[PDB]
Amino acid sequence: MLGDVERFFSKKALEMRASEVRELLKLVETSDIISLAGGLPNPKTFPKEIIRDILVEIMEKYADKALQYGTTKGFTPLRETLMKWLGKRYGISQDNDIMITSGSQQALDLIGRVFLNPGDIVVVEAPTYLAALQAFNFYEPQYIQIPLDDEGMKVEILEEKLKELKSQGKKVKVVYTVPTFQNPAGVTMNEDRRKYLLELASEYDFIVVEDDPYGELRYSGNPEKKIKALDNEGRVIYLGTFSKILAPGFRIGWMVGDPGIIRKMEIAKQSTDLCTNVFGQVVAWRYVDGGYLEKHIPEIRKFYKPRRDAMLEALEEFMPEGVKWTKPEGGMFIWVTLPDGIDSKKMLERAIKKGVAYVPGEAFYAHRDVKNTMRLNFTYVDEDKIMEGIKRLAETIKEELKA
């Protein structure tokens, strides 16, 4: 029969809906139209030769350890090499424990699982990483959005909302942030605001989740200090991944924080799934332990830097008065802001008609209260197409301002 399965779905499943951002992504797929809506790394940055060497190495040196089931916590040597690497590169204390994941999505799912009760308050930036919203929504948290400026989260507004909540006899459970080359804003929290965030964390007693997928993709400026590096009380849970630094295909990430928190995270992961593909973990271990990572990073930076510069140059020359955009020091995105009255969601129609696409920023807001923004990607498209893409977008904006 295959009748209305609706009768079987749970309440939390009946409300579920397809991801809108994906509905248009596939819509632009297989088309000659210049798409700046994607969020994928460029396959050209994949260390294929190095991957090939590691694969051969594995099948002759660690075949059984890469093919057999592993412990839920993750491949031991990968966990050790990572902590050594994070310590000797970011200054993260060894006092923290570590667990391997499949990336931020899963890591956030576990966090929302171990920390979120229906109605708990979660602080998120505005805009914020769409994936995080997807992961936490299942736990029905109460969202509080903190706007960003050219220097990341405006922590002063956070203190304001924290005092406001306290007056209501309430508190925040978790503060989730992507402080470096944010998706989608492409902005970076300055050092003073990071410390400021940690001071609020102890004063209001909440946990900070620092999602850092793009940190190594720095094209200019000086490396920033990780919020986890400034962690003294162990209130920060740091999330990392090899997705943008190796290849998405393997899907291996990590979570670093208080050993007492990792403990419950592990137990929760035991019910979600046995363990991440061990094969991928062994590949990642060799990638870092073999020093290939340190050698490849500068190579990825060289490839993306000119693409970012090409897009910033094109914007500054083709965009009309009123249009503003962030200027990231790294990452994969540029956040554009149009004059009030303009709805990027509705302008997408006229935009694609001119041969250019992007992601309306509205999807990146928890409460969706901003409609004049949009995310642009400069890593998947070629520099020559970037100039022409930004141009078509510039005309799209100029026209919708008149008629």
User: Please, which residues have CB within 8 angstroms of residue 274's CB and are 6 or more apart in sequence?
Assistant: 69, 72
Cβ(156)–Cβ(192) under 8 Å?
A: no
Q: Which long-range contacts (CB under 8 A, 24 or more apart) does 61-70 make?
A: 62/282, 65/278, 65/282, 66/278, 66/279, 66/281, 66/282, 66/283, 67/278, 67/279, 68/278, 69/274, 69/275, 69/278, 70/275, 70/278, 70/281
Nominal resolution (angstroms): 2.2
Residue 161 marked in a binding site: no
User: Please, which residues have CB within 8 angstroms of residue 288's CB and are 6 or more apart in sequence?
Assistant: 78, 81, 82, 85
Residue 358 marked in a binding site: no
Residue 145 marked in a binding site: no
Residue 106 marked in a binding site: no
Residue 69 marked in a binding site: yes
Residue 295 marked in a binding site: no
Residue 243 marked in a binding site: yes
- Domains in the chain: ranges and CATH: 1-67+293-403 (3.90.1150.10), 68-292 (3.40.640.10)
Residue 280 marked in a binding site: no
Residue 219 marked in a binding site: no
Way the structure was solved: X-ray
Crossing angle of helices 278-289/76-90, nearest 10°? 40
Residue 105 marked in a binding site: yes
Measured CA to CA, the distance from residue 245 to residue 335 in angstroms comes to 22
Residue 10 marked in a binding site: no
Residue 183 marked in a binding site: yes
The pair of structure tokens assigned to 283 is 């590949």
